[PDB]
Scaffold this active site. Structure first.
Site, short mmCIF file in Angstrom:
data_model
loop_
_atom_site.label_atom_id
_atom_site.label_comp_id
_atom_site.label_asym_id
_atom_site.label_seq_id
_atom_site.Cartn_x
_atom_site.Cartn_y
_atom_site.Cartn_z
N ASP A 35 0.81 -1.21 0.00
CA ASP A 35 0.00 0.00 0.00
C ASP A 35 0.85 1.27 0.00
OD1 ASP A 35 -1.97 1.94 0.32
OD2 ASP A 35 -2.48 1.35 2.38
N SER A 199 -0.72 15.76 -11.89
CA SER A 199 -0.98 15.40 -13.28
C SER A 199 -1.22 16.66 -14.10
CB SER A 199 -2.17 14.44 -13.37
OG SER A 199 -2.55 14.23 -14.72
#
Ligand SMILES: CNC(=O)[C@@H](C1CCCCC1)N1CCC[C@H]1C(=O)O
EC number: 3.4.23.22
Length: 330
Positions: A35, A199
């Site tokens: 994770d 992004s």
């Protein structure tokens, strides 16, 4: 040193991925959920409340000659889906894909929430976010990666998740045969303890690319892709009959649909998520309504590039003094 381990979807929908991890002496092999959105290594154990264990493999420190109680240390964590676990702490030898760390904090669960109990395939979590998020008290502990870093050939690990297929976690090296084209690296902020990046935008299907900054985290421990409601609405508007259902808890779409791809920007580069990756199947067995793999982050507080996004790429988690994230097509 290096390590290389195969990671395997727990079910036919890629709801999560499990990776075998060797703990203790003689080795006890548990299947852990790697994770990158958390920083605790915790396991079902001989200390876990009996009624909360249902099929999981447990760690028994009394059977490990290298286990040592980390005296007085406790831990308690809750995740984004509302699940939780807590207990005490041992140190032991932990190996992943041939890479060995001695003195790793292994957090033994005394209690786990129902969602963990109900999932017989996951024996615990192995956190790979920054150690500043580790919940051990009163002495915060390092992640497996943090502990391994100085010994690694290169201070990196990579995630190469498969679509409805196994993939690979590598430690200490970049497999240049595992991707196509080049790797585009992008800046990381560690200010919230995550692999947080920005992004450069998105496109829906064959649509024009929208240049826009989207801050989010690269999180292997989250199944879906969570993005701003504007972005998510633009995507599902291209699917006839798709709608957001409060009763179901997100966007659903007719199982008869052909889903469009979704493109996200990494610097000037583009990663394309095929439409099939965004299909998470009937909301209930036999239903004609299917659950979408792109969902709104509006009720989370952060955008999350989870497995739906990451499995479309070869992803480099660069843990150099100035951390960065790399994405390649594959
Ligand atoms: C067989 N393993 C153990 O006895 C564990 C001990 C660790 C704490 C309780 C569970 C079992 N260690 C290994 C060295 C001796 C002992 C210790 O830490 O004192």
């Amino acid at each position: 040193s290096t390590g290389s381990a195969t990671t395997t979807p727990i079910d036919s929908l890629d709801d999560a991925y499990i990776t075998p991890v060797q703990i203790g002496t003689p080795a006890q092999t548990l299947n852990l959920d790697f994770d990158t959105g958390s920083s605790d290594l915790w396991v079902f154990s001989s200390e876990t409340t009996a009624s909360e264990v249902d099929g999981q493999t447990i760690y028994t420190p009394s059977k490990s000659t290298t286990a040592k109680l980390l005296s007085g240390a406790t831990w308690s964590i809750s995740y984004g889906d509302g699940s939780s676990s807590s207990g005490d702490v041992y140190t032991d030898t932990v190996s992943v894909g041939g890479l060995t760390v001695t003195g790793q904090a292994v957090e033994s669960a005394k209690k786990v929430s129902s969602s963990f109990t109900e999932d017989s395939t996951i024996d615990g979590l192995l956190g790979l976010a920054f150690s500043t998020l580790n919940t051990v008290s009163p002495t915060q502990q390092k992640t497996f990666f943090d502990n391994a870093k100085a010994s690694l050939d290169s201070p990196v690990f990579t995630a190469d998740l498969g679509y409805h297929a196994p993939g690979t976690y590598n430690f200490g090296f970049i497999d240049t045969t595992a991707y196509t084209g080049s790797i585009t690296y992008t800046a990381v902020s560690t200010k919230q303890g995550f692999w947080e990046w920005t992004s450069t935008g998105y496109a829906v299907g064959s649509g024009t690319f929208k240049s826009t900054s989207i801050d989010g985290i690269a999180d292997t421990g989250t199944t879906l892709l969570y993005l701003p409601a504007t972005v998510v609405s633009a995507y599902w508007a291209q699917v006839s009959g798709a709608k957001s259902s409060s009763s179901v808890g997100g966007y659903v779409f007719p199982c008869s649909a052909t889903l469009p791809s979704f493109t996200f920007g990494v610097g000037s580069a583009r990663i394309v998520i095929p439409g099939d990756y965004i299909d998470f199947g009937p909301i209930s067995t036999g239903s004609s309504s299917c659950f979408g793999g792109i969902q709104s982050s509006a009720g989370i507080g952060i955008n999350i590039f989870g497995d739906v996004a990451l499995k479309a790429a070869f992803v480099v988690f660069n843990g150099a003094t100035t951390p960065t994230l790399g994405f390649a097509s594959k």
